[PDB]
Amino acid sequence: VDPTHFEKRFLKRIRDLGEGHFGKVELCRYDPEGDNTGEQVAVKSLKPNHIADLKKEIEILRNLYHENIVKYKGICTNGIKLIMEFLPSGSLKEYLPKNKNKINLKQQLKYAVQICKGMDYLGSRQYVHRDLAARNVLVESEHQVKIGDFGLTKAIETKEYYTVKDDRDSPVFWYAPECLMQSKFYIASDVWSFGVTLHELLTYCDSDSSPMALFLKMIGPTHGQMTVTRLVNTLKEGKRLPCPPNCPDEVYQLMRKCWEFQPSNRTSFQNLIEGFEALLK
Ligand SMILES: N#CCC(=O)N1CCC[C@@H](n2nnc3cnc4[nH]ccc4c32)C1
């Protein structure tokens, strides 16, 4: 028997966990016994082409092994489903609003370290994530977080960046200037998205403090097609997202080092780790 092969007949849909534009993740129970004692697993499938994309995401996740990366469990098979461990606390977007009392600054800085280690492990395997947002960070417990989606993850050739072809559903408010302008994607461009994720983490993912809601105030919500070009000017000028409430200046400076206009002048994941670890001591 292949413990990574899940049979369709025993894979039972419970509820939806989230969706992209072509993908969706559901909570399922893999129940071969038929008595509802089987394990709960998270299942990624296509929304009814993108089979090639999902297949590449599977092969990428299958070979990543890190405590801050959601565990690959297997596949369900021309169609295919990705089986992962299920994390009941969901994403930081779900968890943080409901757990402000439990999650103090020290714990948010520990989550920040964990995101950086998982992201640094990804960079080391020569991958650019391209979609680092609090909605993609899963909560394992009060003491641990995991990167939980690799839907936009691309390999970097030999080259320092991956060049973007499809960009119509780009999370623009999480994107570095080189991504919004040229459509290039470096490890340093994931550092920029980490800065924005760190901002979300510090504001406990509150809808009103979202990087989009905030950036739409800094530019205007009624600009339709011109939003990105107007956003590109803001960053060109030198305007950044504000310091989150109750966020120490030492923390906000580590965040600003993620937001240098030029990728080569940006901090690394290793520097952020050292910087966060010094504040925790
Ligand atoms: N498609 C897509 C993205 C998507 O559905 N999500 C973003 C990544 C995390 C997904 N999610 N939400 N709650 C979850 C609990 N356990 C999980 N295990 C794997 C994903 C996942 C969960 C939800």
UniProtKB/Swiss-Prot annotation:
Tissue: Expressed at higher levels in primary colon tumors than in normal colon tissue. The expression level in metastatic colon tumors is comparable to the expression level in normal colon tissue.
Subcellular locations according to the entry: Endomembrane system
All copies of domain Protein kinase, residue ranges: 11-280
Phosphotyrosine PTM positions: 161-162
Annotated catalytic residues: 131
Residues reported in the UniProt entry to bind ATP: 17-25, 44
Post-translational modification: Autophosphorylated. Phosphorylated by TYK2 on tyrosine residues in response to type-I interferon signaling, leading to its activation. Phosphorylated on tyrosine residues in response to interferon gamma signaling. Dephosphorylation of Tyr-161 and Tyr-162 by PTPN2 negatively regulates cytokine-mediated signaling. Ubiquitinated by RNF125; leading to its degradation by the proteasome.
Lineage top rank: taxon: Eukaryota
Notes concerning its domains: The protein kinase 1 domain is also called the pseudokinase domain and has a regulatory role through the transactivation of other JAK kinases associated with signaling receptors. The protein kinase 2 domain is the catalytically active domain.
Illness association: Autoinflammation, immune dysregulation, and eosinophilia: An autosomal dominant disorder characterized by immune dysregulation, severe atopic dermatitis, and chronic gastrointestinal inflammation. Additional features include asthma, food or environmental allergies, as well as poor overall growth with short stature.
Function as written in the Swiss-Prot or TrEMBL entry: Tyrosine kinase of the non-receptor type, involved in the IFN-alpha/beta/gamma signal pathway. Kinase partner for the interleukin (IL)-2 receptor as well as interleukin (IL)-10 receptor. Kinase partner for the type I interferon receptor IFNAR2. In response to interferon-binding to IFNAR1-IFNAR2 heterodimer, phosphorylates and activates its binding partner IFNAR2, creating docking sites for STAT proteins. Directly phosphorylates STAT proteins but also activates STAT signaling through the transactivation of other JAK kinases associated with signaling receptors.
Record-stated family: Belongs to the protein kinase superfamily. Tyr protein kinase family. JAK subfamily.
Subunit text: Interacts with IL31RA. Interacts with IFNGR1. Interacts with JAKMIP1. Interacts with SHB. Interacts (via N-terminus) with IL2RB and IL10RA (via its cytoplasmic domain). Interacts with FER.
Name of protein: Tyrosine-protein kinase JAK1
